Amino acid sequence: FQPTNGVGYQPYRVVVLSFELLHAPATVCGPKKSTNLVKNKCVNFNFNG
Amino acid sequence: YFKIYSKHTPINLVRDLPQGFSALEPLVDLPIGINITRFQTLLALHRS
Amino acid sequence: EIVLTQSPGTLSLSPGERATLSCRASQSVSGSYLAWYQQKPGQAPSLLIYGASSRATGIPDRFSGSGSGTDFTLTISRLEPEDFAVYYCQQYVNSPRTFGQGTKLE
Amino acid sequence: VQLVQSGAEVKKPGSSVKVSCKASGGTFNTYAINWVRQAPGQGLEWMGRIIPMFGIANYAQKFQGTVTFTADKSTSTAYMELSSLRYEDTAVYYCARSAYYSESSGYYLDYWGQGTLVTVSS
Numbered sequence A: 001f002q003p004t005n006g007v008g009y010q011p012y013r014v015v016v017l018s019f020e021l022l023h024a025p026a027t028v029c030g031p032k033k034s035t036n037l038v039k040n041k042c043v044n045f046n047f048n049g
Numbered sequence B: 001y002f003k004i005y006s007k008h009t010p011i012n013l014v015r016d017l018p019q020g021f022s023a024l025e026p027l028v029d030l031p032i033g034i035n036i037t038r039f040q041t042l043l044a045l046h047r048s
Numbered sequence C: 001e002i003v004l005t006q007s008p009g010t011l012s013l014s015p016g017e018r019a020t021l022s023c024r025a026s027q028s029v030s031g032s033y034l035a036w037y038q039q040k041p042g043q044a045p046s047l048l049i050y051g052a053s054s055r056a057t058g059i060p061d062r063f064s065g066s067g068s069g070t071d072f073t074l075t076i077s078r079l080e081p082e083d084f085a086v087y088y089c090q091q092y093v094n095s096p097r098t099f100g101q102g103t104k105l106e
Numbered sequence D: 001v002q003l004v005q006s007g008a009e010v011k012k013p014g015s016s017v018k019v020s021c022k023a024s025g026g027t028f029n030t031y032a033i034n035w036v037r038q039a040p041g042q043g044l045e046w047m048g049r050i051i052p053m054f055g056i057a058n059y060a061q062k063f064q065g066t067v068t069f070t071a072d073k074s075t076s077t078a079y080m081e082l083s084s085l086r087y088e089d090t091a092v093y094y095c096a097r098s099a100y101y102s103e104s105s106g107y108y109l110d111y112w113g114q115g116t117l118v119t120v121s122s
């Protein structure tokens, strides 16, 4: 790789991420988009499933 | 799913299995999904 | 609106060598929605390439794209006298199919 | 495959004109037709596209209200109407092909016509 060169001849760092979709172990998960609490009114609740 | 449940208890005996009641609370749940039909233990030995 | 600027405006100067015609855009060209065109004087433009590097029917593979992101390359491997013509770019990303200003104009 | 273009128009300023791009068989239904200005001694500007099956024409912000696109399903001919000849409207209009589809997302100009020269005179 040379500093003054075409981008085709310039470095690209590649970080290949492999993710299998069975998800039975589920070792890595997203934040899961927790909302806020709105008590004192009838609401459809879903605390932790 | 592999479930390992653990508890600790102080005792004051020389050789027995203590009587009484003790509930073993959960510790960890490994989601491994492999067949297990054989198990073994691992000790430690002293040397000098 | 994604403007395109061709960088070598008159690098050719009746070129006898391989070229490195370029195009750059304000927002990166998404999914290689670019094309090149051959506008021989006194005649209409002829498609030279689509996608990033995909060649064209009746156009030799000596014409070679080499772009990604800010898609920027048209490379004449062995230069021939008849192929001289102002070369244009055009992007199908968001833009109302806008064109560049031409790189091989006398 | 061949998209012959109308001849040069002798249009005095303010006088309207309509170009006549002629599609070969099988060109209109499968493919869209698009118009580029190609102003004299200058670059290429995309006026808009004609979908000749669903009669859909969409124009760029610059040319909106100044040009009208029409196409004839029978006789397979493409037309572009200039509202009036403004002084800068002198140019060499070109009609070309397109994809206007999903599976083929390359919306490039497949085949270009000869071109029509509009001016104050000839």
Ligand SMILES: *[C@@H]1O[C@H](CO)[C@@H](O)[C@H](O)[C@H]1NC(C)=O
Binding pocket: B033, B034, B035
């Ligand atoms: C466990 O044994 C079953 C027997 O039917 C087999 O189908 C499965 O593939 C085995 N799993 C592993 C991880 O060896």
